[PDB]
Amino acid sequence: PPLQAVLVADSFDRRFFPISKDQPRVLLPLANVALIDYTLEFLTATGVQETFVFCCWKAAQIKEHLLKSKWCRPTSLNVVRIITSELYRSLGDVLRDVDAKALVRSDFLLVYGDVISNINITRALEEHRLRRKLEKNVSVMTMIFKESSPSHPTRCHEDNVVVAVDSTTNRVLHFQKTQGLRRFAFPLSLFQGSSDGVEVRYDLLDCHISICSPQVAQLFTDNFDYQTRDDFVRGLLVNNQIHMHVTAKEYGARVSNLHMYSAVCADVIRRWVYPLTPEANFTDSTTQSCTHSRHNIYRGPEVSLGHGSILEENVLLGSGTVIGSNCFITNSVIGPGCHIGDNVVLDQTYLWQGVRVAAGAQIHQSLLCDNAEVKERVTLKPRSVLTSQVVVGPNITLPEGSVISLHPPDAEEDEDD
């Protein structure tokens, strides 16, 4: 059967809500490229021949962005179908609707709209199909993981997880998240059933990719209280069975906060998601052409950086990004059309399209959204966010936890300097 996937282009949580009032999370650029573009490229490369897009919040912008992409073309292979509705507001509400409309007929892949990965799912496909054929369709979902050290910056505390898995058949017997927990509790139900190869694993990174079967849609329809995949796995492991697949040589991660954003951007810039590198141009557009150099230097067309400026390490330059003199840029991604002043340093920052930086500014570990503006003699401490063309006053330093936007109750006051 032709492989198909279900793509959810909406995260039903307020974890990106100094920003998401303007554009959805799936449209946020990771490295000059939208988040949903990476997921679509991964789905196309992994062998999926048809995808369904379920967008509820700001569906018009998502549809407009998708229709002009390379994935909507007569020559494309992974045909996309955009389904927009304001009724559903949860993953369960979408999985119980995909069953009602009978869109899925075989083993499909359930993946969010902000997953950055290059994992080949063919081996997982074969393992899941063999398990279902041999066990009279007992397994219902194979969740893709990735072995990594717990101290890696990619593993955040919010998305941390620990499992108790039988090593013989790599089937999940317990699933819980470690959020503010110093000790972990494991029941004795799994030990009694099989005492051969029970193993507790804490070195697995939640890739958030889970290939499923229409039985999962039927179960989600049956249980109205189910809203999230975590709820489904908790309800299934208490009362069918769930297996996993462990990846060791391929990259995979889903962004959910600024920490995940920074980690994924750093990994992508350092070519950890090859061949999905900025210079590869996996999306066929003329405004994202780059050129790779030593120490991972990416330069767009017509940059024209000023004299005396040094690009130290892992910097992406957009198309038409004017750079001043005596600059110092390292570990930062700058979008197209930006104007950079003089004697200005950038360390682990992220500048989107349209930002202007005056001379003398010092920005470290910050994020600037579209059309933002920074005046002279302004110092930005780490973990500061400027959104939607907001401006700051000259000779003013922002504290560490200083998020500034034009919305009164969310963050600090408007752009009026």
Partner 1 sequence: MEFQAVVMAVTDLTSSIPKPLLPVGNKPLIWYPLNLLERVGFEEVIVVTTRDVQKKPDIVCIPDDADMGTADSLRYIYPKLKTDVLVLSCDLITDVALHEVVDLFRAYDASLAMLMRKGQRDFIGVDSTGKRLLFMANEADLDEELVIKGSILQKHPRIRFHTGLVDAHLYCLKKYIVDFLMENGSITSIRSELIPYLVRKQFQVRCYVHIMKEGLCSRVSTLGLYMEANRQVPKLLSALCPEEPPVHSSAQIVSKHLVGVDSLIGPETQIGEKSSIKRSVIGSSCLIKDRVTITNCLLMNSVTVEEGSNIQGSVICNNAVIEKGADIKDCLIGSGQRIEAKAKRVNEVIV
Partner 2 sequence: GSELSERIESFVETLKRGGGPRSSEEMARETLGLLRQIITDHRWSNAGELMELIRREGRRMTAAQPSETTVGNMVRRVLKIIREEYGRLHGHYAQLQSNIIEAINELLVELEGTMENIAAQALEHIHSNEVIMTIGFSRTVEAFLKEAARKRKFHVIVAECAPFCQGHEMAVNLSKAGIETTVMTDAAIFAVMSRVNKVIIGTKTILANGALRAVTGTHTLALAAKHHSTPLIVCAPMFKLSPQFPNEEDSFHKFVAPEEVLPFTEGDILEKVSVHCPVFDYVPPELITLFISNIGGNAPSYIYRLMSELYHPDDHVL
Q: Report strand pairing: 161-166 vs 171-177.
A: antiparallel
Rounded Cα–Cα distance for residues 253 and 208 (Å): 7
Which one of 12, 20, 45, 47 is in contact with partner 2 (CB under 8 A)? 45
Instruction: Check: CB of residue 341 under 8 Å from CB of residue 324.
Output: yes
Check residue 271 for interaction with partner 2 (CB under 8 A).
Answer: yes
Closest CA to 158 of 179, 183, 172, 128: 179
Which option in partner 2, partner 1, none does residue 146 bind, with CB closer than 5 to 8 A by kind? partner 2
In the list 63, 270, 381, 407, the residue contacting partner 2 (rule: CB under 8 A) is: 270
Binding mask 168-187 for partner 2 (x = CB under 8 A): --------------------
Using CB under 8 A as the binding rule, the residues of this chain from 128 to 167 that contact partner 1 are 149-151, 162, 167
Say whether residue 203 binds partner 2 (CB under 8 A): yes
Nearest to 243 by CA among 48, 388, 107: 107
> Residue 51 belongs to what H/E stretch?
strand 50-55
Among 344, 336, 262, residue whose Cα is nearest residue 310: 344
Classify residue 27 by its DSSP letter: G
- CB nearer to partner 1: pick between 17 and 184: 184
38 belongs to the binding site for partner 2 (CB under 8 A): no
**Residue among 65 and 201 whose Cβ is closer to partner 1:** 201
Min separation Cβ 2 and partner 2, Å: 16
Nearest to 327, CA basis, from 341, 347, 348 = 341
Q: Between residues 239 and 286, which has the closer beta carbon with respect to partner 2?
A: 286
Which residue in 187, 193, 235, 275 binds partner 2 (CB under 8 A)?
275
Reading the block at residue 129, the tokens are 């199909």
| Helix or strand run (H / E) with residue 259 | helix 258-269
Give which of partner 1, partner 2, none residue 200 binds (C-beta under 5 to 8 Å, depending on kind).
partner 1
- Distance of closest approach, residue 377 Cβ to partner 2, in angstroms: 30
* Torsion, Cα of 76, 79, 85, 86 (10° steps): -60
Residue keyed to tokens 């101290």: 151
Name the binder of 270 from partner 1, partner 2, none, CB < 5-8 A by kind: partner 2
Query: What torsion, rounded to 10 degrees, do the Cα atoms 376, 378, 384, 389 define?
Result: -20
Supply the minimum distance, in Å, between the C-beta of residue 145 and partner 2: 12
Q: Which residues bind partner 2 (CB under 8 A)?
A: 45, 75, 77, 146-149, 151-153, 203, 248-251, 266, 270-275, 277, 279-280, 282, 291-296, 313-314
Binding-site ranges for partner 1 (CB under 8 A): 149-151, 162, 167, 178, 181-188, 191, 195, 197-203
